[PDB]
């Protein structure tokens, strides 16, 4: 269901998680476009269990990661490129910041063994837009638009 | 001084921390503007000490705090009359969230007594903009803009 929230002051702990398909993936939003009526940011919190990442993906707008506990790699690929191509992989740990360029093919993968990954996500212009790509080789041409995405299906469907 | 960086992943824990004269507060712009080359979204991790408030001001953008330790109270007045107003005082407290709608002038006072209270600052629109009131019945047309704010001061002086 859509959950929607007018008031001022939330407590993040009683907004309703999912993983909403993504296996391995807890998340939660924090200050939204459909959920709470935000227009130029939006935030999100999300865990990642041991071993699982995000899809591959590109979205047409900021997004700003803040690691508040565990650690992991970070997927880039090329925008130079047609297709976003073996991707370098970047080390980040608790207490570290990214930010994805606009637009950029790109993966987040819990690559430690042994504790959750949780990150504090913030992207602008939402809600997202945001690409999948199948695998590294995929043209930029070929990413499919999932839009919305899982965590606005419910409330997009019930605007209607 | 002014520390930039534009590398993909940076330490939060070696970034730049100073009160920049403010008693009781502690400042790191973790994702910014002129420090990182951000355009659309900017964060701040905050340290405010007992008793203390920021300032009452206003900044025609949306910012939302994530309450990651402490507990305090959230002063809030409206936009639309001419000034702001007898304000709500709405408590908030570890793991709440809250947003300011656009141009709503505001306060943050850690009233606890005894913890330190810190916050996630998420803005659109960076650098911030804001508009100080000396008092809650100041106009809104008299609020003074302090541009850069202290925290942007030497990368602003840097980057004319
Ligand atoms: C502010 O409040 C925040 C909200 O409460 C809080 O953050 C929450 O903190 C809790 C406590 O740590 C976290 O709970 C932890 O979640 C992780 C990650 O979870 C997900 O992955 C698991 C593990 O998975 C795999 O193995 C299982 C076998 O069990 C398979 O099924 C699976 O396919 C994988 O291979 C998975 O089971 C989870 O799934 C279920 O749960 C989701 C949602 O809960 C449902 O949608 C789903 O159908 C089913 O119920 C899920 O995908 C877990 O690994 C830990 O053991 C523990 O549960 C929350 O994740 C976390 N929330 C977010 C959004 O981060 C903050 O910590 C708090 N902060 C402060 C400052 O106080
Ligand atoms: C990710 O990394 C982050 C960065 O390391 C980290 O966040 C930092 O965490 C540390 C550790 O907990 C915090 O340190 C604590 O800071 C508080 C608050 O400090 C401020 O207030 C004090 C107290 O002020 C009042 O009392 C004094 C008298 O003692 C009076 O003078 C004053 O007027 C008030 O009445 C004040 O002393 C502090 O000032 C000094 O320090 C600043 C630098 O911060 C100088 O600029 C200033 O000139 C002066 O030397 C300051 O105003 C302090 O009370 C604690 O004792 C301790 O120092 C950091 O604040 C915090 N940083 C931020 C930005 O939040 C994260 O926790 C870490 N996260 C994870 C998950 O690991
Ligand atoms: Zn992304
Ligand atoms: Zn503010």
């Not at 929607?4 to 999912?18: A, E, F, G, K, Y």
Request: overall charge negative; charged content about 20%; proline content about 8%.
């Amino acid at each position: 269901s859509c959950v929607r929230d007018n008031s001022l002051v939330r407590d993040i702990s009683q907004m309703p998680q999912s993983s909403y398909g993504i296996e391995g993936l807890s998340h939660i939003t924090v200050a939204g476009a459909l959920n709470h009526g935000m227009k130029e940011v939006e935030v999100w919190l999300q865990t990642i269990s041991p071993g699982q990442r995000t899809p591959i993906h590109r979205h047409s707008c900021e997004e700003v990661f803040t690691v508040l506990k565990g650690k992991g790699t970070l997927l880039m690929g090329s925008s130079s490129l047609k297709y976003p191509g073996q991707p370098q992989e970047i080390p980040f740990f608790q207490n570290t910041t990214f930010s994805i360029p606009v637009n950029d093919p790109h993966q987040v993968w819990n690559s430690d063994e042994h504790e959750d990954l949780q990150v504090l996500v913030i992207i602008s212009r939402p809600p997202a837009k945001i690409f999948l790509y199948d695998d590294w080789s995929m043209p930029h041409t070929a990413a499919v638009l999932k839009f919305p995405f899982v965590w606005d299906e419910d409330c997009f469907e019930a605007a209607k």
